[PDB]
Amino acid sequence: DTKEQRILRYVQQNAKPGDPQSVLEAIDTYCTQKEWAMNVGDAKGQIMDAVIREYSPSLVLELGAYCGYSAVRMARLLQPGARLLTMEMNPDYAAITQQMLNFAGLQDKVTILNGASQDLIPQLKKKYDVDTLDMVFLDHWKDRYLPDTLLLEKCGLLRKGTVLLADNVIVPGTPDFLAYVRGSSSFECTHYSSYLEYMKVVDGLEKAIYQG
Numbered sequence: 647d648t649k650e651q652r653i654l655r656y657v658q659q660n661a662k663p664g665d666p667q668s669v670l671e672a673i674d675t676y677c678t679q680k681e682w683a684m685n686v687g688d689a690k691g692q693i694m695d696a697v698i699r700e701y702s703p704s705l706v707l708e709l710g711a712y713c714g715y716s717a718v719r720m721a722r723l724l725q726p727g728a729r730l731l732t733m734e735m736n737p738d739y740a741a742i743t744q745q746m747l748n749f750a751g752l753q754d755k756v757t758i759l760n761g762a763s764q765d766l767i768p769q770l771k772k773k774y775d776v777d778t779l780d781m782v783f784l785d786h787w788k789d790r791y792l793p794d795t796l797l798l799e800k801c802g803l804l805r806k807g808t809v810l811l812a813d814n815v816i817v818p819g820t821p822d823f824l825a826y827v828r829g830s831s832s833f834e835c836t837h838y839s840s841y842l843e844y845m846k847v848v849d850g851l852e853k854a855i856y857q858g
């Protein structure tokens with residue numbers, strides 16, 4: 647028995663099936679009252695809701711799924727026919743995320759790509775019929791934010807107005823990505839201050855909007 651499948655079980659025992667909001671709240675209390683996990687969490691969760699409502703993206707790419715919390719968070723707010731793609735390298739995690747999405751009712755909105763983003767991003771246009779992404783959520787290993795951003799730009803996945811939204815920009819930190827995105831005239835940035843999940847340490851999301 648694994649921390650993640652401990653969470654999956656809590657959800658299946660406590661959330662109302664087919665109800666995304668309920669699933670989220672089961673995850674948040676489980677992680678607030680018993681075991682800490684690295685889900686984006688509710689406080690930054692609300693920021694993400696707001697940004698997605700604003701842009702209403704047709705096509706979203708998530709880097710790093712884990713137990714499915716942020717994928718459920720985002721897919722619940724997508725319009726009919728909009729699509730989330732989520733990359734997860736750990737198959738135990740990609741298996742839980744599927745079960746979590748399934749429970750929430752969101753499996754028709756969300757495609758799990760099992761693998762490592764560096765390998766999967768170049769396969770995106772060919773194997774998944776992607777022209778450009780409207781939004782990208784970055785929440786995988788922190789040393790991967792910049793290289794995957796440069797890789798998305800390289801494979802032609804970014805479009806004038808594509809929104810990159812980055813978790814953990816302060817804690818644990820992604821200094822090279824922040825420096826690159828703020829300094830670059832090809833990305834318009836706004837910082838949205840908040841607090842780490844389940845603990846009030848100051849983290850934040852960076853939104854970085856691709857300029858071409």
Ligand SMILES: C[S@@+](CC[C@H](N)C(=O)[O-])C[C@H]1O[C@@H](n2cnc3c(N)ncnc32)[C@H](O)[C@@H]1O
Nearest residue numbers: 685686710712715716734735762763785786787
């Ligand atoms: C911080 S957790 C993601 C949490 C999720 N975004 C949420 O809010 O619920 C990070 C995940 O990224 C996965 N990961 C790390 N590096 C990756 C990579 N290069 N490609 C795909 N997945 C990766 C890890 O296996 C881990 O499950």
Ligand SMILES: O=c1cc(-c2ccccc2)c2ccc(O)c(O)c2o1
Nearest residue numbers: 684685686785786787788813814818
């Ligand atoms: O790779 C990590 C590693 C951590 C992490 C680093 C040190 C201790 C615990 C978690 C992490 C935390 C919160 C979070 O939202 C993340 O996306 C994280 O990603």
Ligand SMILES: [Mg+2]
Nearest residue numbers: 686785813814
């Ligand atoms: Mg995070």
